[PDB]
Enzyme design. Sequence first.
Site, PDB file in Angstrom:
ATOM      1  N   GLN D  11       0.818  -1.209   0.000  1.00 24.42           N
ATOM      2  CA  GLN D  11       0.000   0.000   0.000  1.00 24.42           C
ATOM      3  C   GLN D  11       0.854   1.262   0.000  1.00 24.42           C
ATOM      4  O   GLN D  11       0.651   2.154  -0.822  1.00 24.42           O
ATOM      5  CB  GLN D  11      -0.939   0.008   1.208  1.00 24.42           C
ATOM      6  CG  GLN D  11      -1.695   1.318   1.393  1.00 24.42           C
ATOM      7  CD  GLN D  11      -2.760   1.234   2.468  1.00 24.42           C
ATOM      8  OE1 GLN D  11      -3.593   0.327   2.468  1.00 24.42           O
ATOM      9  NE2 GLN D  11      -2.736   2.182   3.398  1.00 24.42           N
ATOM     10  N   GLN D  15       0.855   3.944  -3.144  1.00 27.46           N
ATOM     11  CA  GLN D  15       0.277   5.267  -2.939  1.00 27.46           C
ATOM     12  C   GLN D  15       1.339   6.362  -3.006  1.00 27.46           C
ATOM     13  O   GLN D  15       1.058   7.482  -3.433  1.00 27.46           O
ATOM     14  CB  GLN D  15      -0.465   5.320  -1.603  1.00 27.46           C
ATOM     15  CG  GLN D  15      -1.667   4.390  -1.550  1.00 27.46           C
ATOM     16  CD  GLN D  15      -2.509   4.581  -0.304  1.00 27.46           C
ATOM     17  OE1 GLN D  15      -1.990   4.862   0.777  1.00 27.46           O
ATOM     18  NE2 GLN D  15      -3.820   4.433  -0.451  1.00 27.46           N
ATOM     19  N   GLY D 144       2.905  -6.168   5.840  1.00 25.58           N
ATOM     20  CA  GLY D 144       3.236  -7.555   5.572  1.00 25.58           C
ATOM     21  C   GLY D 144       3.755  -7.727   4.157  1.00 25.58           C
ATOM     22  O   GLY D 144       4.700  -8.477   3.917  1.00 25.58           O
ATOM     23  N   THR D 145       3.127  -7.023   3.218  1.00 23.71           N
ATOM     24  CA  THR D 145       3.547  -7.049   1.822  1.00 23.71           C
ATOM     25  C   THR D 145       4.809  -6.214   1.633  1.00 23.71           C
ATOM     26  O   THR D 145       5.782  -6.669   1.033  1.00 23.71           O
ATOM     27  CB  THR D 145       2.440  -6.514   0.887  1.00 23.71           C
ATOM     28  OG1 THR D 145       1.261  -7.315   1.028  1.00 23.71           O
ATOM     29  CG2 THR D 145       2.895  -6.542  -0.572  1.00 23.71           C
ATOM     30  N   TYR D 224      -2.707  10.211   4.590  1.00 23.47           N
ATOM     31  CA  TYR D 224      -1.695   9.568   3.758  1.00 23.47           C
ATOM     32  C   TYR D 224      -1.361  10.442   2.551  1.00 23.47           C
ATOM     33  O   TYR D 224      -0.206  10.531   2.135  1.00 23.47           O
ATOM     34  CB  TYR D 224      -2.174   8.190   3.287  1.00 23.47           C
ATOM     35  CG  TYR D 224      -2.057   7.083   4.315  1.00 23.47           C
ATOM     36  CD1 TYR D 224      -0.937   6.970   5.129  1.00 23.47           C
ATOM     37  CD2 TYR D 224      -3.070   6.146   4.464  1.00 23.47           C
ATOM     38  CE1 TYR D 224      -0.831   5.957   6.064  1.00 23.47           C
ATOM     39  CE2 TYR D 224      -2.973   5.130   5.397  1.00 23.47           C
ATOM     40  CZ  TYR D 224      -1.852   5.040   6.192  1.00 23.47           C
ATOM     41  OH  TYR D 224      -1.754   4.030   7.120  1.00 23.47           O
ATOM     42  N   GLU D 254      26.434   6.121  -9.161  1.00 18.08           N
ATOM     43  CA  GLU D 254      27.035   7.320  -8.592  1.00 18.08           C
ATOM     44  C   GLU D 254      26.436   7.660  -7.227  1.00 18.08           C
ATOM     45  O   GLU D 254      27.076   8.328  -6.415  1.00 18.08           O
ATOM     46  CB  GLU D 254      26.872   8.504  -9.545  1.00 18.08           C
ATOM     47  CG  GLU D 254      27.775   9.672  -9.205  1.00 18.08           C
ATOM     48  CD  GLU D 254      27.630  10.828 -10.171  1.00 18.08           C
ATOM     49  OE1 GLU D 254      27.263  10.587 -11.338  1.00 18.08           O
ATOM     50  OE2 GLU D 254      27.881  11.980  -9.761  1.00 18.08           O
TER      51      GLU D 254
HETATM   52  N1  GTP Z   1       3.952   7.654   4.248  1.00 18.21           N
HETATM   53  C1  GTP Z   1       3.035   6.719   4.013  1.00 18.21           C
HETATM   54  N2  GTP Z   1       3.000   5.565   4.768  1.00 18.21           N
HETATM   55  C2  GTP Z   1       2.066   4.611   4.528  1.00 18.21           C
HETATM   56  C3  GTP Z   1       1.130   4.783   3.518  1.00 18.21           C
HETATM   57  N3  GTP Z   1       0.331   3.693   3.502  1.00 18.21           N
HETATM   58  C4  GTP Z   1       0.740   2.840   4.470  1.00 18.21           C
HETATM   59  N4  GTP Z   1       1.809   3.403   5.120  1.00 18.21           N
HETATM   60  C5  GTP Z   1       2.583   2.832   6.233  1.00 18.21           C
HETATM   61  O1  GTP Z   1       2.907   1.488   5.949  1.00 18.21           O
HETATM   62  C6  GTP Z   1       2.908   0.714   7.129  1.00 18.21           C
HETATM   63  C7  GTP Z   1       2.112  -0.563   6.889  1.00 18.21           C
HETATM   64  O2  GTP Z   1       2.416  -1.080   5.612  1.00 18.21           O
HETATM   65  P1  GTP Z   1       1.340  -1.082   4.411  1.00 18.21           P
HETATM   66  O3  GTP Z   1       1.952  -0.590   3.121  1.00 18.21           O
HETATM   67  O4  GTP Z   1       0.148  -0.242   4.789  1.00 18.21           O
HETATM   68  O5  GTP Z   1       0.829  -2.604   4.286  1.00 18.21           O
HETATM   69  P2  GTP Z   1       1.211  -3.518   3.020  1.00 18.21           P
HETATM   70  O6  GTP Z   1       2.562  -3.143   2.457  1.00 18.21           O
HETATM   71  O7  GTP Z   1       0.131  -3.424   1.967  1.00 18.21           O
HETATM   72  O8  GTP Z   1       1.264  -4.997   3.654  1.00 18.21           O
HETATM   73  P3  GTP Z   1      -0.083  -5.776   4.079  1.00 18.21           P
HETATM   74  O9  GTP Z   1      -1.290  -4.877   3.952  1.00 18.21           O
HETATM   75  O10 GTP Z   1       0.036  -6.263   5.502  1.00 18.21           O
HETATM   76  O11 GTP Z   1      -0.227  -6.956   3.151  1.00 18.21           O
HETATM   77  C8  GTP Z   1       2.320   1.584   8.231  1.00 18.21           C
HETATM   78  O12 GTP Z   1       3.309   1.970   9.157  1.00 18.21           O
HETATM   79  C9  GTP Z   1       1.780   2.804   7.525  1.00 18.21           C
HETATM   80  O13 GTP Z   1       1.931   3.961   8.320  1.00 18.21           O
HETATM   81  C10 GTP Z   1       1.158   5.943   2.753  1.00 18.21           C
HETATM   82  O14 GTP Z   1       0.333   6.108   1.856  1.00 18.21           O
HETATM   83  N5  GTP Z   1       2.113   6.908   3.005  1.00 18.21           N
HETATM   84 MG    MG Z   2      -2.045  -3.917   2.190  1.00 21.74          MG
END
Ligand code: GTP
Ligand code: MG
Lengths: 54, 334, 427, 437
Positions: D11, D15, D144-145, D224, D254
Amino acid sequence: MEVIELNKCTSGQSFEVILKPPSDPSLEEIQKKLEAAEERRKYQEAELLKHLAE
Amino acid sequence: MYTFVVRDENSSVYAEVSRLLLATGQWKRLRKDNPRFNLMLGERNRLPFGRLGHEPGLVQLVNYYRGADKLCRKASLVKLIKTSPELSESCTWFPESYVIYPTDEREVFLAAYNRRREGREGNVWIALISSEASELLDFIDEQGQVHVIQKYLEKPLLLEPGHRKFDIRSWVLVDHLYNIYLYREGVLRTSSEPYNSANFQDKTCHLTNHCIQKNYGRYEEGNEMFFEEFNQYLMDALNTTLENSILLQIKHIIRSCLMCIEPAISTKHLHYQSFQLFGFDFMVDEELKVWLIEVNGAPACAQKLYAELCQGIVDVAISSVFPLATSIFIKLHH
Amino acid sequence: REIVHIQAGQCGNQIGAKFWEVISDEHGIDPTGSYHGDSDLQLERINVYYNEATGNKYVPRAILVDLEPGTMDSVRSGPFGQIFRPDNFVFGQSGAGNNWAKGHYTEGAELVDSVLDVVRKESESCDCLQGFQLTHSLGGGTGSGMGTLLISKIREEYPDRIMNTFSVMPSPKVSDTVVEPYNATLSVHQLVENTDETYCIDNEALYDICFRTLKLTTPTYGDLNHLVSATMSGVTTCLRFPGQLNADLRKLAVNMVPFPRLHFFMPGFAPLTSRGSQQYRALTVPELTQQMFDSKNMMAACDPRHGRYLTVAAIFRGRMSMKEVDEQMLNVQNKNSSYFVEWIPNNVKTAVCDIPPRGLKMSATFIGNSTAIQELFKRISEQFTAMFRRKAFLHWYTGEGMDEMEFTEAESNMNDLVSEYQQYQDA
Amino acid sequence: MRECISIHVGQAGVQIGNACWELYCLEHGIQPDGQMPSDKTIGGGDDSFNTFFSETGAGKHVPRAVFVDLEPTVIDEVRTGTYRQLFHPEQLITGKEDAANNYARGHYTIGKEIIDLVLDRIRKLADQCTGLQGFLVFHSFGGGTGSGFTSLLMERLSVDYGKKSKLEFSIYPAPQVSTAVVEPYNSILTTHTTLEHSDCAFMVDNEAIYDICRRNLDIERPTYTNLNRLISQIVSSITASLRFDGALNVDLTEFQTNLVPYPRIHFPLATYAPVISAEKAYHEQLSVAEITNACFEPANQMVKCDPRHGKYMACCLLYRGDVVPKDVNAAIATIKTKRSIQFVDWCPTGFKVGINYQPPTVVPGGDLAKVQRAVCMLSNTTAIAEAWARLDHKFDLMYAKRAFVHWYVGEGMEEGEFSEAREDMAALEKDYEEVGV
Ligand SMILES: Nc1nc2c(ncn2[C@@H]2O[C@H](COP(=O)(O)OP(=O)(O)OP(=O)(O)O)[C@@H](O)[C@H]2O)c(=O)[nH]1
Ligand SMILES: [Mg+2]
Ligand SMILES: Nc1ncnc2c1ncn2[C@@H]1O[C@H](COP(=O)(O)OP(=O)(O)CP(=O)(O)O)[C@@H](O)[C@H]1O
Ligand SMILES: Nc1nc2c(ncn2[C@@H]2O[C@H](COP(=O)(O)OP(=O)(O)O)[C@@H](O)[C@H]2O)c(=O)[nH]1
Ligand SMILES: O=C1NC(=O)[C@@H](c2cn3c4c(cccc24)CCC3)[C@@H]1c1c[nH]c2ccccc12
Ligand SMILES: [Ca+2]
Ligand SMILES: [Mg+2]
């Protein structure tokens, strides 16, 4: 103090300024880690279904 | 209801502080490893500064300045003074010192050792106290750790009656706004046995530590002369005051030392804040010239002054950050 | 991620029907199954609990189970009785007579396969089934006995799916029969092994709330269920509506359960209200936070100060300052950090939903994994022992083929569970 | 010209990727439909911007990027977003169910059933390259991902693309925007497994970004989107040298050369200034000296730490807007005499400077005001190890009780990997210590 490597272009320019001088695993091994972990999952699931069988 | 933790059980100063805080009924002590604290009375070694100021919804304060060790270690203090333009090198109030490593500035130290010998002037130094360079270098290498060699003040001011040696301890509190507060009450840790000029082997009248001395308690209670008596002595025996003859130099040295390291340790725009109590050791020669001996990062107080000082710490270093539902400090302005 | 709902027994169906009645109104669904709302927030995650049919009809993904038709006939004639898929009504005729053995081993075994066929039919329609949620009591025979039988067989066919339960605990204050401690102890044994998340809904707590706080002289089951349906709506909010985290059953389990067996949660709710009586004054955020953490607002008769919170999940509903919520929730943790274990950093999470429940401008629901829950199981264990030491009323069970040893085993495991919760209270 | 492929995992990765590529388009004058009027070489070319954008005969400029999430929810909003036409289906990869905040579930269980597909979709992009440099990988530490699948991907990339560089843009977890209680576990686990496979990683602590948005943009509760638009500005400043004409950090190798002398210690600290609110009525524009001096304030760093109590190994200043070398040198000379800047003995005390005359581009309707000059400082300082210390401490508290460990063991991971990961982190903290004090 000393400015060096001044490179200029239309977009901008870059340089360096010095103040003071100084004083992998293989595809095999990976597929082995993933499959071995899969075996542990299969073993756990089998132990559950065996427990449920009883 | 503020919260705090204690991570230095051996601190006599902050044992009294934690007591005072609880007695207000607005401060609650947590366990050692509870991160949800407002105040941290930190340990002396490996204080985790990196884990401070990262708790959402908590203004955090610690009783130590990260980086202040450069001022409070003998090898560091010499290096700090010698390399800092605000202090180095024509520093008039710090004895001539050198950093020596066991088998560095050893060759530099000998170059000055020649002038004093090829000048027939005073040539006594201190790490043990000796007038021979060879006796000293053999002692440092036999100990193991890093030592500092310093010029011994051969003509110290001597109290009468007794013809005694002494050193002045000043307690200084630096709050979170880097206001430098000098505790109005200092103490003279005096020697009881008369100062001997010829025999340096007898280190009981040369070293004025409260432990070594303990003729203990002959002239004053516990080899500790406070400022009211010492001021009275200066008036009667030398026709001057403590303020004019000594304290101006003291305030100057304190102010100068902490101003020098301010940009390196200040917590002005930091995510956590720091205050710290320092104990400055001064030495006075017969010409009423004040010399800085060193700075202690974790100072203990005098039994008479604990109640007043420790309460003082709460008022300007703690309650200033965490308010509750004339002054004993002299603000060294800058 | 679809959830398959199941409700077993008299209690299970009565709180289950009430649950669907409440959230249907929140999602704008009428008894006909037609949507008549005004916000798109209502339909965004409505697939979690509802199947969609042609003409945009929304049908609950619910399976109604019992061993006697009495209570289920009342559902089908109730307010939202017609919304349920008629084929999902699976019932016997003999009843269970408040007997765990009958529900688990004889009468229920005869009906359990018919239920699993309906579970299978619902599951195959799911794009990606996340798990199951069960509503039932532990003091009876059907919801307790057959309910735990279903859970075991569902785990066998869906071992990689989450099992959640809303388990109503028995209490002498609100008792049907004397054998409730037997049925409950036998059921807890099952829930410890075969669920990931169990909300402990204690009738003792529900009664005390109605009597002491709500000033209801003689509370009925309907009065008790007003608190249940309010709680159930709350804890499932983050599953039903678009939120910051978009919670599901598995992610909840991972964050709430540090050790697999310790998955019995204490729910809480604020403000506490009685039926009919409308409140005119909305609670301030500090009031919601203070009340929801109070023992008087706990749906499990356990004193939270007698233990420590392993994990806490909270959800504020209504239009409010989420900044103020953050400050107040952080304040609770910072004021009472001793009642939160220090070896699980940041073990309190709060969410906010714009949509408030019916009749309230704002509310706060509490989900706590506290070691104080041991008080609940100790209470059941004492009542169990008082009878079992004389083998009283045991003939009702041995008559269905059960042996005394199975009671001894169930007793030992619940006492183990108690000592396990005690282990982390002094960590 | 040499091409770079961006990979967005989880995620946070996706994003943030959306924020960056949106900004990239605005900077290069590329429209949502992929059309770039200023590009007069229709159907191809080898300009600097072609490092990130390939071209079709129809004149569409498409990102050399792949989006991957084990859950379809987040990427589905890319498929239907305003920049839906920009990417093509083969770049957007989605699974059925996420990793549930579990490293093991993302690495071992679910990662195994999609790793081959992803590499195939990446290979397709690599085939369209004439001289691939390497990859830019965006992901979180806590997800997790983001944690699990990333480490698996990075392992296979070192096998399939052994000669190629690999850079990271990683989101360090913060309780203020927490998604899981086990984020410290996932962070340590993914760092351990990815460390030997990453050449240079830019960590962004959500705590820092969150507070910068509150303090400087007056946003009480940053979303976010608020975080990501600020991050994309930082990311853009770092990658600008790859996408525009210049002579500093022109290629991926570099970056390691100028920022990473010691391989394991490859986490440069990013500091950005100025961050100004768009709805700030009256603003006095800040000078070169003022923005440069701001690069040494902890309140402007992507990770809250104290560089005064560490040592520098390298330092790059990346200016955008009205800036000339003379004012930079004048600013540095002043700052040097006012602040504590200690370089390690085996490094020259100096700064590599890059300037782009085009000021930073702001997203229309965003929270960031237009400024005449901005700067991003990339300093490899040992002070960033404070973040590892924080993280490792939270790890130790939970793991001492083996809390939540069963969730990882249940996915086939061994409890030994926890201790192995933590040991590698213990060595890392030691490495920083040796260099720093
Ligand atoms: N800066 C920022 N951090 C994010 C964003 N979305 C999620 N996070 C952070 O990512 C962490 C959790 O990982 P995620 O990316 O949401 O989850 P994932 O990578 O999809 O893994 P799973 O959902 O468990 O399968 C948290 O600490 C969030 O604060 C975003 O859009 N911007
Ligand atoms: Mg996710
Ligand atoms: N250069 C010098 N000339 C003369 N006397 C000196 C001196 N340096 C030290 N002394 C004397 O030696 C004594 C002890 O030295 P030092 O101050 O190094 O020990 P210390 O660390 O115990 C002071 P503190 O206890 O406050 O830290 C001082 O009190 C002073 O009496
Ligand atoms: N809260 C609540 N509890 C109930 C209700 N009906 C029964 N119970 C409880 O459930 C237990 C009896 O189980 P019951 O559901 O009637 O047996 P079953 O129908 O065979 O599953 C007793 O301890 C009751 O207190 C109800 O409507 N609401
Ligand atoms: O949305 C969410 N998803 C999760 O996993 C929940 C969570 C629990 N803990 C979390 C931690 C970290 C991050 C998220 C969560 C710390 C310990 C417990 C969280 C939540 C907050 N209030 C709720 C009300 C009902 C259902 C879910 C929730
Ligand atoms: Ca072109
Ligand atoms: Mg009944």
